[model samples]
Target chain A: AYGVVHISVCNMRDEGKFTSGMSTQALLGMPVKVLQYTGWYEIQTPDDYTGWVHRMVITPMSKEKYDEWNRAEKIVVTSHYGFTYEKPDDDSQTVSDVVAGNRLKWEGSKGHFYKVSYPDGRQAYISRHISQPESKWRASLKQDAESIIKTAYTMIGIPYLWAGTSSKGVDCSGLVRTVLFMHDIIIPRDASQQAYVGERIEIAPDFSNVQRGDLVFFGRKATADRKEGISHVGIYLGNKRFIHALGDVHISSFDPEDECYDEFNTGRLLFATRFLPYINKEKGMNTTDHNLYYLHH
Target chain B: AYGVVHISVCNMRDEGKFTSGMSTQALLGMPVKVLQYTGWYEIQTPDDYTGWVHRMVITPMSKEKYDEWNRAEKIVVTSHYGFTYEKPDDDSQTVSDVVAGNRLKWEGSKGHFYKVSYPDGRQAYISRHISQPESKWRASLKQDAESIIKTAYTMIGIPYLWAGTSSKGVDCSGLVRTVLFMHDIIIPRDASQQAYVGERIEIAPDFSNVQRGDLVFFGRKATADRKEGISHVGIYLGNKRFIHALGDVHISSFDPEDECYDEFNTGRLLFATRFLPYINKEKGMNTTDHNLYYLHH
Candidate 1:
């Protein structure tokens, strides 16, 4: 049942066509379960959302290997874009190109490089500046909204791509997913799935109650008895302004008087949700802080 | 000698990935030839560029079937985004998601919908407004600068993706290839290859003379005795300005004093070249009229 996505982002299509609905994305290092495989692997993501992802996008592993890899030392690529080389030298043969947030097995540290291996057994070396020990990176993660907001600010001008999940370009949910991912918080792959995370806070008609770092959603607003309608999402700044991927990774204000106000999105603005309360809640050992089951070693 | 790209865009990566480079792109519906297959297929695209694409990203076809498909009446989806349904009904099972510029075999037309068949034998229906017969679509393609610019504007805010070749996202050469493709003019898939297509026009030390629709190039500036470095590319929108996929599809100017002046790109400005003259001429065909060999029937 355990499998890890190997591509930068795997598209979950509606049916068979490659250029189809990108209902969600599966990141390179994210693990999931195979519900079934009928040419397409009907996959159940960590967030428990099910969809048919194309075959071959995921590397299935036995329980033993899955647990072993999960516990082993890994290297988390920190640079926006990077790759491993046949040798430590830039002139060496290429291994594979990796986007930020992609993880690989860590090996020897010689010179200023870290030797790494892909799941398929391809070996190469990456510069030290681009990656960190996965254990250390995870250990240092702080579940602070301020840090998450700062990271989100770094991606402000990145162009919005439909199914993008990298630093080069990011979709709305991808932006949220990747931002949370940097601080070692595992979230859902799609915006709708993410909407279910954290404590839901109802937005008032006056719009004065939205808090900083709250997740604001928009689309066809769904009532308590209505079906799911969550489509787009973004991070709310302290003021009435929120940064999102509309046209591009840009900021839009809820206030109609502001020049950057997005009237189109504002009309569809739904309720808000907060995740900070559930984060690091205990007098803490790292494992006892948040829902530690979601954190990897 | 024929196959279709199975992925949205397949990376032609074989170079030392220490600094990974986009070898080129393979678009949906674009045909290619398989010289052989290893981990990657040594493919010869219709534009005749030889490179290795991942083996799984292309669907192999027999020459007979290839010819049959080449001659068969096909529908080119014109809308930027759409999907095919199992039945003519909008609520029917989805056949597949189709991107703009993708093609499908056209079948019976009924009740304002056209029955379409994918290369894989999947059947579906597309709305009449989103597609057109190959004949009508190709006949309406204009080789003029304004038409090319109008098509370029369609992709203004599309995120710039590495090796991406569709309207969903595009790279420097991918942007050029797609724009030319809309006008029924098949060009090479990489910026370096496209730099050689049209009549070369040299630039003086200072920008004195340049033409609209001329393909402007930037990269490692080539030397006079050696082939000057031809890398990044954009379309000349006139007034010392050009539109390209730099970070995103935005315009930049040659004039340093202009607010939109691009210092980094301006420094790499190689000379500009024009393909429109070769596109349509009054005399005969070939150089005079756009090369129709690349045009689908």
Candidate 2:
């Protein structure tokens, strides 16, 4: 069955336990294959990674409903945090709290708010200003090196959350994923898996040639007896430093003299991957013509 | 009708509007006065503070149902976090995530789990170990200066959230409130209000005299020209150190020589309040005979 994460951030636990270690995350609008269902569905992501998630978090549907929702006009919630109300008035009870990157099907505007629907048919209204109708936003997406750099900077000092992919909280892969997501480019859900694609580049120890918007991966460098290890990924900001959710979304420099020099991550530097080429593939980021995706197996 | 927060932490806003600034918070199990019901309720907390809260978070009850719940067997969640499941199995769907201090009505046990119900009709099962039936816990509450100090230490480094009252997140007074709440002693919710009660003690700057379990307040010092001011509060851990949730739950020392010294908060120290006497008023640190309280005018 086809499904999408209906919640702001659907936590996929290692097991069915709520505090069960968050193995990964599925953001709003992210699609998944329903592999199995217990308390949650053992789902496979576009990255092809499988994890157990709560059933309600993913709005499951038949092919007809999926196409129906797909055909319907949609809007991506841009608010860091807000809620859909039961009625058109702001004073209605909350349907649920939403975060940035969450998707809701747009019905229409009434009294200056957009009437949106969750996959389950629960109706609510959200502020039109926080979300742009899918057709409009895709055409307006401005993905550039500066845009990526600016987004990462604004997230400086946010506490790291496992499997988190919202403005309120985020993980390493979650951090980079959302920034690119703003550019209408979808990527894999994990740090190691994200390494598989994207244009790879040699990132020397001297840090001579790195550009903004390039993903700097950390793990075992391709050794005499080993394949490249990819345990973590960060967005390179064209300086000696980069920003990622290391404990928290913070910047650490390769330069030893820098105040926030992280010797540990710098020592494990592997390679860098350019993601702009993927952005270049879909000019204008028109979701009207093309759905957001990655070259995933 | 009466209700409790069916979820972890429920935010109360200044208005019924979703964008309305948060006025305060109500933790799971905490009850409020249902003053008026619109889309949200204009409610006054047990703390007597008035604000607008979503009606959904509060399980509305008739006066009879309220008495029934208040008289029924209850358990206070002691774990920082856990979840209620739809079925007895550990892997069942999560009914709701809970925090320490959440309240649930006991409905006996199944295997190693205890059946519970929210103030609303939702039913779920929780692990027996995470909670104790009210009778047993009431008999076992061990409130000591040492106990309070130890519990505060366990929560070090948790993020500070305004009006948050859980181990996962805590605000200034929320930290002090929950610690005391743990010992079956209920103190006022806000820092300034908590100052109103409790035995006052002179706090000299030289560390001449202070004790563990004393409440240290931070704000403007009272003078001949003005009233006593209280803004933030923390549990004194003796040795001139205190734990608080500033950016995150951390320890700060009044001594300048200590590496964790916080000169800003320490300098603003106004006075100290001893809560030990109040516990003496109740005779036992038990919610059995007398329910925990927040003085609502």
Candidate 3:
């Protein structure tokens, strides 16, 4: 059995209970593979991250229904935050809340809104200014450093949440994943998992060769006595500055002279990785359209 | 020892570990009692809800510091969402994200901005339009049903989170807690506990006698074979309609004829309670200024 997230943000737990620790979050309209079903469904996300989600948070369906959903015309939310109204007018009651990356099947268009249907079969209208048809959104994607860096800036000041991956909140790797996702790339879920992807870039004292949009990692670096591991990740934004979610999403500079110099992260700065060159070709880095998790396989 | 939440929303866990199940959320500037300390602090919120919070999420303070904070001139965020900038200008980089109910120490006023100091001593500027002095806010608060119901409406369409209690997200009782908090009222944490407070009002079939702003609870009623219990709650909005957070913060009607009628909740309707008459006097219900949790001893 399989389905997609039915709510704006659904929390996934380590066990099939609300009392279990939160492992991650799934956004509305994202496809997931159901591994088991009881009170809660054990599931796997597009990034291959696994956890258990309550039955209500996901819309379980047959293989045929999943295929129908995948092939349907859809609209993707492009803005950081928005809502779907019960009526076409803005003054109408909201059908549900939505954040960026949330998708819904497109029905048609009203004056300034896009008529859409939720996975639960509820229909509503979303403002055209905040969303775009999935086809147009995929067509407008650019695989470049500038596009990645620009997308990161738009999320500045979103509060830090340990496992958060939405516009509401985010962790370090969640920020990196979300930014790369806005540009249509799908990467592994954690900082540790993310470090293994892309081409490994050598570390330098001045970070001279580090280009804009490279994924900079930080944690304890390996010595002969210890093994290397990554705990945090961020997007390098040129000028020795990088953006990540700490207490909140903010920019920090590696240069000591800069006002936002991060002493802690600078001291633990690990090697960087370049994902821009790989794009849709690498195993762990695939475009959403080509990602196996989103396909009907 | 006691301190306050330093971030927009701080997650509280069942145990002193990140892997523990989340118990609730603490908003920025909310006072908390430190029951114990390790890497994570075992803490008690103003509502007497106990949980463990990560050290980074809270600002630890001595009795003197906490007392100083209570006496300091503070500005509270009044908007659903906003930001504090590094500088007074809108073009300046954001220092942090803020949501409604977040509080900061007032330094002074800049051009259309309030110069504020965070609990961690970070300085930033927030828009004057989105905040007011804590004293002014308290003075403006009215102890009435209309004010409580009005505050709840402003939060329409926010997504649901199991243990959420902020503008970012909320559960059934969390929604009621937040709405009442905006009016300077502090109540119990969970719906079961909330059902114990306030005067119990008889529930009528048509809900004709149920006044607007009454808290309507729903769950299994007492039978000859079992005892009664409460599991869900919402604010009574009259005309057989009430608002609550299920998938999202929304209005639902008990009237079968209404477009948004919720049959499940209506079938389990338990009873109703009124908090308006007992504000700032009852044990579990107290104004922020009068609450013992906020008072320095």
Candidate 4:
């Protein structure tokens, strides 16, 4: 099966014609799925409505393109209420919100704004003042930590929307889906579905040797009616906080002694699992930090 | 609070210059709230992220406008995959999906497409190939039914993006939030949060007396360990099937005898509570026929 590239970009003028009617039409965002590309591509908008547009309108990137972009020197969002638009121009509409610690593809500068494209092919302009040259540490983590962290960070402040797996809003399991999907790791669409995917591991042993990319599961306590089971999953971003979308995208500690464990999250504690071997096999040594950054002096 | 109005007009356009770039600069798909207008009024996108555009771009309709449109002879989806985009040609993009037995707003025709707008301001160019104009009965039920159904159906097919509230994807509670928000009803953010907002109807009511717009809660069987309760919820759509965004937007039967009740949905039943009194007071209607549509039509 052909692996689907989730998003595509196109030169504005060459893409499909914007219906000249209400200016409101321009304000409405349409989700475009690229069907095929020769010189032109058949694309489907958000409404699952399809239309043909020139390839120029879409900056078509494969998983290879994503990998290449991930390795480039980066600019991260430093301000509250910051945003990334669908194009390079500052005036371009915001496709998603950008906040502290989130990273982007640094495609050089256009006036006072930094032009960047998201993994989804949506481009945006960020203010130069709020961004600095990519840090070595940040760049080093770009391929591993940043990849997951940036995706997870996008959900910050989004009200917890249920069953949501898109940029609109997300839930706990939805957070896992959002981050992993951005990394080209496609898992099933739900928590239960995710509970079964990847190799299952015992909590004690896996927890002892856990590295940066390990997944942690939470479940309920054993009771008369039913036994304890995995209920929630989050990427174990080392340090105290694990990145998950609860109310909004924010970091919460994993201290077993902390209140979070005593809360319902403790009961859902299954075990930590790793897919690092699978990820490495699929992408090779490219997962290393050196391959992830351009090292701009 | 400003009362919702239905405006009536033949056609409208954005007559402002430098407006195109400005509108483009605004976030895409953000709802523009109608502020003030004379011959031509400006509508703010609901998200308030974008600048204002002239009302001409949209076919403005008042309560009377909607009444007029609702009195139309027929309405239908004009495009393939027609089932998804409800109220197809509404000036607003937020009008829910249009499945069989739903109502529609009919504008005149442009080539093979219908030029229509929903009460909300979403507009689209629906192809005439697949849609059929709604019948008189469907139209009649549309007013009462759609007002109720539209709130619930807006979440159809959206992926379960956790913590997501926008159109990208939605969770079970987020689905309820968005649907109710469309109707101008407000609620706290999460399932646990929402569980406290409405009046507590201690007993889980039987399905028969449940009205169309009631809320149904589900969670583990009440026990000592799991007392927060109401882990999940869905709007009761009256038929045995209720709509929810789990893996995707789907309808599941509520039959206690069915195996699904015992398997995936077991021990989850909490209560079926109605917000009808609040809804009636909010919208100022006496008896609502939201559920009667299926019966009367």
Candidate 5:
């Protein structure tokens, strides 16, 4: 069985209830495997993350419906934030709010707006300026460090939302995961899970080999008393500065002289990993087009 | 006995832990009453709503310290969203994200920025164009209908967050409460609680007496088997239109002929309330300045 997320951003809980902790979130029109149901449905993301979501947020389907959804032409929101209007004109009333990474079925186009269908069959129009045909967007994907870092910059001041993977907010790994996902790369969801991605980079005493776009992690070193744990992650921006969400998304430096220096994070730095070189060539790494859940037989 | 929120947007849980469901949210610099501690401190908002918040997001302080903070010149963010930078220059690195209704102590001014002190004692510069001296802003406040509706419109495309009360995202009553808060009026949290405010406006069959700025509520009506319930809320825009946050903030109409008509919510409509006449005079309705937690001995 399979399903599609209908809401722009649906909160997924650890348990099958709203009172349960928000474990993660799913964006609109993303296809997922329908694992089971305990009233709240258990679903897996295209990136293979699992969580419990309510009926209102996701529409469950059989393999046939899932394949139909996947085969349909779609529009993906490219801007940090946007809206789907009831009418094609910009002055028309909004049908729903959209954020970076949300996708909808492409029904047709009207001037500057693309008429899109929500997974539940509702229709609305989005401006072409902030969205693109999914196939065109997928074909343009080529991972590079600088582009990924710049993508992170666009979310500079977003709030630190636990389990949030949209520009509305993000936690530590959610920040890195969503930024890379925007560039068509999908990775694991949490810091500890993402800590294992790519080939490990050695940390030099003077920090010479560390490069921009490297994923730096922090928590505790493996000592006799405690196992090594990774609790936080951020994208390195070179010269010892990295961007992450603590209270909100902002830059911090490991260099003592830099005005953005963060002493606490600097002291707990574990190691860094480079993901660009390993994209599509490794397990736990895949692009949107390659992901079996997105468009596959 | 008291504390002030330090973070831009702090999640308040039902229990004193992150694993607990998010019950509500607190904005930066709001005065809260520290009731008890269970590792996570229980705090009450200025409107008397209670929830559990971590120590990291709120600064516990003496009554004297809170008084001193209230006495200090402060700047309030007027923009829907903003950032405080490390320097007075616009191009400087950001220290934190801020949203409308966030308050910080004014330190001094340099060029186009106002140096502001976060409740945690961190200093940063906020642009003058998006903020105002707290006292100056408060003195200019007056209660009117159109202004509050306009305030709600400014948040048209923000996402719907369960406990969110900022422009970053908001639930139904969170939308109404924050809009009124921006105009200096404070109201009780949650839709069921908010439903009781103001003089109850009779719902005529023709919908003749409902005015702009009235609060419309929806849910089950009282019956022989069940008591009346209020589950949703929106600000009336008059002529059968109202604005609210469902999937995201948007406009909907009760008129059957209207293109934006919301049939589901319209069928569940319970009653409406007018808040303007009761401001400062009724319980659950007080402006920021008159609130005991704000600037009081």
Candidate 6:
């Protein structure tokens, strides 16, 4: 019912300013979700918060592209150790380690290594010696979507790495970006940049009208603080649960009575933006933007 | 309650042997769950697949260590247009580009660049000029267990980087390592490594007695491919859902009706293991295993 896009975290910038926050301000190699895109992209974070990020920071993946990569016949690990890194030149640092028979999304090859994207959205080079390409099941579009989502779920506990879009670790925004990108969705890099992309919708203050695939936004204070305004975003999956990636992808609820929701117990539930239906419509899919009644069908 | 860990991807071996598979086969920066670890350790993948990995592949983290890094007054991005490659220092290719303000986990300085771990599990070097330090929230153990789980949930779509343990990106094992580390729990790196650490329990053929925080294992056809047994693992979170890191961190259900569960359906539901109580006991906290009870609790 929902069309999800997988994206990668490029970097965080000062609102409108090319450079404001430190280069280490946000985790790199992280993935995020693209709720909508206009001048900027509205992104969802793993924390269920919404934000606006620069459009330049994110790259969208297409189902065909994912299918192409998923169809790779073989992959070789060139690195000496099982560890892979973000940069092919950097040997000391690793993005993630892989052994023989490990499945990878082939991005092409450089010298002896294969450029690949992890299920979690981390792109890195793998040594040909350590890995060998293996046959895998051909994934359909829905399967690709499911695969990308499944991939994002794999990094459940990584620490928040700045400007990181690799498996090494990621932040909330990074998580949303990477997962969407894997599924061929493009979004901006940071949360603030993402806030600028989507259409604004008025929602009931109580969050009773929200449904799955809706984009939810959050900030520390009511006033619009550009730096902190719309700092986080996440995809509402209904039943009070949302999906995002701050440390690593997992699910959390917003029930006031639940212990997990205590920190997020803001008196005012922010407006929800329905974007997935529009995206599916754009893709020419027969989908509706209504509530669970439509989802049941 | 379950604890999670997010590790840095830089400190991993690529070609070494692990408890589940080989070091070269493991994905970098992906998060995995720790099932058990005495001298050896066993870990689980996001798909509830488990295997043995080496203890050497992981660096046990404590809440203090996470807090120390989080409390660091200044951190800087030492790279410009930073490239996330497969191997460290072997960049014949680039995976992704990064700029300043990209937060990085400090590993040390190499040449004119500082070696840092990406959230996805890969390591990279950044230039000294782009590096800056800033103060931010320090990871804390004082937070409630659910708070820690909420934090882990934030990393839903981060890319799966090899050897990545930080939030920038993470791997299967890194997810488990980092999440638990955030909660003041320590475990090893790979799925196989964690397998050796926990108290074993017989798996129900139909998973009727599964519970949250239980460890699940997966493998190839046990008959013809006996040697390729237990290739992956995941943390059981009840409701048929489990957390793991593939390309990004996210959640999935084991319901046979779901299309995503097709691949796993072929594999037998391996035995479940309970380590949360054991870990709590180690922490001097009396707790029940409550494996089956947690299904609805």
Off by over 4 Å in 2: A1-297, B280-297
Q: Find the 10 residues in a row with the least total lDDT in model 5 chain A.
A: A90-99
Assess the local accuracy of residue B14 in candidate 2 as a C-alpha lDDT between 0 and 100: 69
Global CA lDDT computed for model 6: 0.46
lDDT of 6 at B160: 53
CA RMSD of all predictions: 20.5, 24.4, 3.4, 23.3, 4.4, 24.3
Candidate 3 segments whose C-alpha is farther than 4 A from its true place: A61-65, A87-92, A107-113, A218-228, A238-241, A251-270, A293-297, B62-65, B87-92, B107-113, B128-143, B202-209, B219-228, B239-241, B252-268, B293-297
Per-residue lDDT over A108-201 for candidate 1, one digit per residue giving the tens place of the 0 to 100 score: 8877788887654557788887788887887876767788887777665444545556664567887877677666665666787667767788
Task: After the best TM-score superposition of candidate 2, give how far the Cα of residue B182 lies from its true spot, in angstroms.
Answer: 2.1
TM-score for predicted model 4 compared with the true structure: 0.32
Model 5's A-chain: what TM-score?
0.97
| Candidate 1 residue spans exceeding 4 A from truth | A16-19, A204-208, A221-228, A280-297, B1-163, B166-297
What 10-residue stretch in candidate 2 chain B is worst by lDDT? B288-297
**DockQ values, each candidate:** 0.02, 0.02, 0.43, 0.02, 0.30, 0.05
lDDT of 5 by residue, B1-297 (tens): 899998777888788866777878888889999999877899999889899976667889999998888778779999766678889986776667787899999999999999999888888999998899988897887579988987787677565777778777789999987898899888989899889989888789777899999999999999999899998999989899999987667789999999999999999999999888788899989987888888776
Q: Count the backbone clashes (under 3 Å) in each candidate.
A: 4, 1, 0, 88, 0, 281
State in Å the error of residue B185, model 6. Answer: 21
TM-score of chain B of 6: 0.47
Which interface RMSD values do the candidates have, in the order shown?
Answer: 17.7, 18.9, 2.5, 18.3, 3.4, 16.3
Best by lDDT: 3
Off by over 4 Å in 4: A1-109, A113-141, A145-157, A166-168, A181-188, A196-199, A205-207, A219-230, A237-241, A250-257, A280-297, B1-297
Clashing pairs in 5: none
Q: What are the lDDT scores of the predictions, listed in order?
A: 0.67, 0.69, 0.85, 0.45, 0.84, 0.46
